[PDB]
Amino acid sequence: SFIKPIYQDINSILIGQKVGEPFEKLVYKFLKENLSDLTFKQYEYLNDLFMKNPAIIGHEARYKLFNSPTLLFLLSRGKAATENWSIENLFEEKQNDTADILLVKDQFYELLDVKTRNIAQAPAIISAYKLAQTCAKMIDNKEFDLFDINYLEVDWELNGEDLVCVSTSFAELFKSEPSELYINWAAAMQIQFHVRDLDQGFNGTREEWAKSYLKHFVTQAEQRAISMIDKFVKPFKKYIL
Amino acid sequence: SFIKPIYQDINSILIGQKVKAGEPFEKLVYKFLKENLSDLTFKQYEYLNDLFMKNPAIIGHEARYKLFNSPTLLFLLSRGKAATENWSIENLFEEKQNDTADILLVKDQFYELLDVKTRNISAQAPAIISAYKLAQTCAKMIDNKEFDLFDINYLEVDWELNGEDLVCVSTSFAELFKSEPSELYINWAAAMQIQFHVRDLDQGFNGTREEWAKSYLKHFVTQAEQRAISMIDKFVKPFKKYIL
DNA sequence: GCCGGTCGACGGGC
DNA sequence: GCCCGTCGACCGGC
Ligand SMILES: [Mn+2]
């Protein structure tokens, strides 16, 4: 995390700003103004990577520029989009992209999401399944010291016509207890939580985090299958008889 | 249906119209219907505001819920205790993008819920209704024998890009209750949404609406059982090896 | 709050 | 095209 060591600073600049989505642009702005050389939006990182490798043409070749199957899986775009890419056909911000912001330096990747809220309902974080896949690849490729998925919550309060930042929170996914992670299966299998109160006491490595998270996903997967029978089958059986 | 009879007209008018998202086409259908079927044509929050406004005596969520005279229709169109509780002429409903129906058409205690879909040409099949929402609707239709009360219909607006602007090329009309229920594709991960292309929706179901409900509920259940099972191969089987 | 279902829009494999 | 995940934004019952 390149953000933790300057989170003091980020908090204080964010506290008192006024406009809740417009808030993440102020996080980007600040980070770009202060960590310029390592601050990227995801489509921007991809553009930079590919521009800097003009000889690397076509999807299969460019897929090799990541030299990480986990990072190829989290950060890369699809075969065709990676094929059709050129200096005249650059990538553009897409919501479907994994990270709000990318911070990279000395081969380390900090995937960062900004979450904005008033004072209610837990946002989508990542597909529980997409995470399981991330973990599997981590473990398979022993990529335990490559990336973090961290979060920044901007808490705002209404004010006339303005919205004002009351406070900020920061959390690191790999510092959380995997089993405390709420999975909303129906809602695109999205892990949901508020950054402000995501547990931060996990005392293992990313390897132990990945194993522990796979245990949780597998567990909940089993639990959902069972829950589906109780919720979606049993009650409706009486109408077929 | 109140638009089935006038569809060649909505089709007449829409085809050939330019727009400089694809969504503003929904805007043109609403304008057309509001003008040619003024009293029937709503938008779920309009009807909601309307139903309550013309009943100033009826106050609070329970009393207002009675206004619907239909468990099944309540389910579809209602806004929940607090929203219904704090509704007034100084706190009217506004359209939410997670309401049931884009457009509501109503005459003589009959309801036509109309969704508008818009598209290019070989696009993703869009969300229709939560398979589970529909499962509850059907059950409610049956528990309460409400088989002649509402239809769920769709209008598809096909556009092609023409330089800066989009030009309506064709349109489609289809009825959910005329589709063969067992053909309805349920995308479980994506909010349990049944997805289909309106244009391709088959319309050869011949039976009571009851038979459609019973037949839908057969599909939903079969599909649910299959999904739960498939979670084991999709989400358990591949990750077991990682358990230490 | 916690839980979890709903509508939208889109990617992206084959 | 079909299949079906992934990210947004949201509701609304306890
Ligand atoms: Mn975001």
Side-chain angles (χ1 to χ4, degrees), chain A residues 1-3 5-16 19-24 26-28 30-35 37-87 89-93 95-105 107-118 120 122-157 159-160 162-174 176-210 212-214 216-236 238-240, chain B residues 1-3 5-7 9-17 19 21-26 28-30 32-37 39-89 91-106 109-123 125-144 146-147 149-163 165-213 215-239 241-243:
Chain A
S1 184
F2 317 100
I3 290 157
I6 55 148
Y7 177 58
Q8 210 299 244
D9 325 43
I10 306 158
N11 191 214
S12 41
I13 186 91
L14 277 173
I15 287 172
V19 288
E21 180 260 45
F23 279 118
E24 69 147 358
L26 306 173
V27 181
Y28 181 72
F30 181 82
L31 257 15
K32 203 84 169 89
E33 270 163 17
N34 289 277
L35 299 166
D37 291 280
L38 52 147
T39 304
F40 303 91
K41 279 166 180 299
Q42 194 178 331
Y43 72 93
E44 197 186 326
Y45 175 78
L46 271 352
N47 285 343
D48 294 13
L49 178 70
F50 296 157
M51 297 197 282
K52 290 159 71 147
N53 286 283
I56 306 305
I57 303 153
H59 68 271
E60 165 148 29
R62 277 159 185 159
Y63 274 17
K64 293 178 168 76
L65 292 181
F66 289 92
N67 286 152
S68 170
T70 312
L71 223 59
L72 176 59
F73 172 78
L74 282 172
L75 302 171
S76 174
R77 261 126 100 143
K79 274 176 190 180
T82 312
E83 183 69 35
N84 301 311
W85 184 92
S86 88
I87 203 83
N89 186 19
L90 292 180
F91 288 150
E92 303 192 325
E93 195 169 322
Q95 57 149 189
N96 267 285
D97 296 323
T98 299
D100 285 345
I101 281 155
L102 268 202
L103 273 82
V104 48
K105 158 92 161 296
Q107 305 287 297
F108 188 79
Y109 294 79
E110 191 174 17
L111 290 69
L112 183 83
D113 278 4
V114 189
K115 259 77 203 201
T116 62
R117 67 183 234 87
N118 196 99
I125 300 304
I126 191 164
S127 159
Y129 177 50
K130 185 174 177 173
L131 223 198
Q133 299 174 86
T134 311
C135 290
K137 303 193 163 72
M138 275 183 108
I139 295 168
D140 289 359
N141 301 291
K142 307 171 317 304
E143 291 195 308
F144 306 123
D145 283 84
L146 230 186
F147 73 98
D148 284 334
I149 307 161
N150 304 333
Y151 314 88
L152 197 147
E153 178 180 306
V154 165
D155 301 80
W156 49 271
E157 191 177 45
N159 185 288
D162 287 16
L163 277 51
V164 46
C165 173
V166 51
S167 69
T168 296
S169 171
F170 174 85
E172 298 179 76
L173 182 69
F174 297 141
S176 76
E177 171 47 52
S179 63
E180 315 303 321
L181 264 21
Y182 184 69
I183 300 173
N184 189 338
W185 287 100
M189 318 190 273
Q190 288 294 320
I191 294 174
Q192 295 167 332
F193 61 67
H194 285 296
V195 176
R196 59 163 56 172
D197 49 48
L198 181 76
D199 178 60
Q200 288 286 262
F202 183 81
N203 286 121
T205 56
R206 286 177 197 92
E207 172 171 30
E208 301 174 300
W209 199 93
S212 174
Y213 177 76
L214 267 349
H216 185 49
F217 181 76
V218 159
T219 299
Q220 298 318 113
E222 288 158 356
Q223 291 310 112
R224 181 63 175 180
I226 271 331
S227 170
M228 290 189 82
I229 310 287
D230 309 11
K231 194 149 192 183
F232 305 124
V233 178
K234 161 176 50 59
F236 302 104
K238 67 184 195 156
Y239 302 99
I240 312 157
Chain B
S1 177
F2 324 110
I3 61 156
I6 74 140
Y7 171 61
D9 300 74
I10 318 161
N11 185 57
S12 276
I13 189 54
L14 287 165
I15 285 170
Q17 287 203 77
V19 144
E23 200 268 309
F25 278 114
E26 199 266 294
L28 286 157
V29 174
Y30 179 73
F32 177 91
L33 288 169
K34 199 71 192 187
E35 283 155 6
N36 265 280
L37 283 173
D39 291 329
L40 281 80
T41 296
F42 291 95
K43 234 151 191 177
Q44 198 172 307
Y45 78 98
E46 282 177 40
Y47 175 89
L48 254 31
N49 289 329
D50 178 67
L51 175 60
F52 294 163
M53 275 171 82
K54 92 185 199 280
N55 287 284
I58 302 300
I59 304 163
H61 67 269
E62 299 303 352
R64 276 170 198 152
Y65 277 11
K66 292 192 193 290
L67 268 188
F68 281 92
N69 245 311
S70 179
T72 311
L73 224 60
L74 198 283
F75 184 68
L76 264 33
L77 308 171
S78 205
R79 278 272 248 281
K81 321 276 178 50
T84 308
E85 187 59 35
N86 307 325
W87 182 96
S88 67
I89 309 306
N91 190 23
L92 301 149
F93 296 137
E94 294 163 272
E95 192 195 344
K96 331 289 259 157
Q97 59 87 53
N98 78 311
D99 281 323
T100 304
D102 290 342
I103 289 164
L104 196 66
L105 310 150
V106 20
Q109 330 306 156
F110 191 89
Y111 295 80
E112 214 197 330
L113 284 68
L114 190 71
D115 279 302
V116 165
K117 308 302 171 172
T118 52
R119 53 167 292 185
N120 202 314
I121 77 122
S122 195
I128 306 307
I129 356 89
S130 147
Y132 177 51
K133 186 151 164 184
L134 212 285
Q136 296 169 82
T137 299
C138 285
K140 283 173 193 297
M141 280 174 69
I142 294 160
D143 290 335
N144 310 262
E146 320 201 77
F147 302 125
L149 178 56
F150 68 97
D151 284 309
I152 304 180
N153 302 331
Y154 319 88
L155 233 196
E156 182 185 300
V157 187
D158 289 39
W159 48 264
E160 72 169 352
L161 183 46
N162 222 208
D165 52 20
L166 293 59
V167 44
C168 174
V169 150
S170 54
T171 61
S172 315
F173 177 70
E175 319 193 12
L176 178 67
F177 292 136
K178 208 161 286 195
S179 74
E180 161 55 46
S182 64
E183 311 290 6
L184 270 31
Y185 177 78
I186 302 175
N187 187 336
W188 288 104
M192 308 191 269
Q193 285 304 308
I194 110 164
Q195 305 154 338
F196 61 73
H197 279 301
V198 169
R199 54 150 78 175
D200 294 326
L201 193 63
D202 94 288
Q203 297 284 272
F205 182 83
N206 52 83
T208 54
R209 199 74 71 61
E210 173 155 55
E211 282 166 55
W212 198 98
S215 187
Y216 180 78
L217 259 17
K218 195 171 202 145
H219 182 64
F220 177 70
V221 162
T222 304
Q223 284 322 134
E225 289 193 299
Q226 287 191 8
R227 176 62 181 181
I229 287 163
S230 57
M231 290 191 72
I232 303 312
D233 301 309
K234 210 80 156 58
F235 304 133
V236 183
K237 149 129 75 194
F239 303 99
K241 62 169 143 300
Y242 296 99
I243 309 317

